[PDB]
């Protein structure tokens, strides 16, 4: 979905293997806040919210705590006490057509 209508999915009551996200090399941005990125496997969490959207390349840096911009002000704002990771990858084949 678009960034103004970003899609949130509730993940709970399952075993989460975060190693398959980490070892694969297609995610250009993998930035975790409040959690060490390599220590994702040993921790247990109560619930996980996965928010998915599509933004352009200079708007990726605004998906972070305490940042400003059009996406941060009007589209998607993260809290300053955010605990979790931002995983962004290029999708030029799937989301661009000529014209």
């Amino acid at each position: 979905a678009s960034v103004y209508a970003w899609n949130r999915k509730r993940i709970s009551n399952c075993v989460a293997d975060y190693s398959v996200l980490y070892n694969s090399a297609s995610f250009s941005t993998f930035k975790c806040y409040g959690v060490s990125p390599t220590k994702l496997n040993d921790l247990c969490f109560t619930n996980v919210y996965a928010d998915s959207f599509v933004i352009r390349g200079d708007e990726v840096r605004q998906i972070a705590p305490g940042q400003t911009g059009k996406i941060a002000d009007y589209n998607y704002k993260l809290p300053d006490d955010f605990t979790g990771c931002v995983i962004a990858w290029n999708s030029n084949n799937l989301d661009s057509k000529v014209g």
Partner: peptide, 10 residues
């Protein structure tokens, strides 16, 4: 285009 998934753990 960049596809973004934000995982937030509570």
């Amino acid at each position: 285009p960049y596809r973004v998934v934000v995982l937030s753990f509570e």
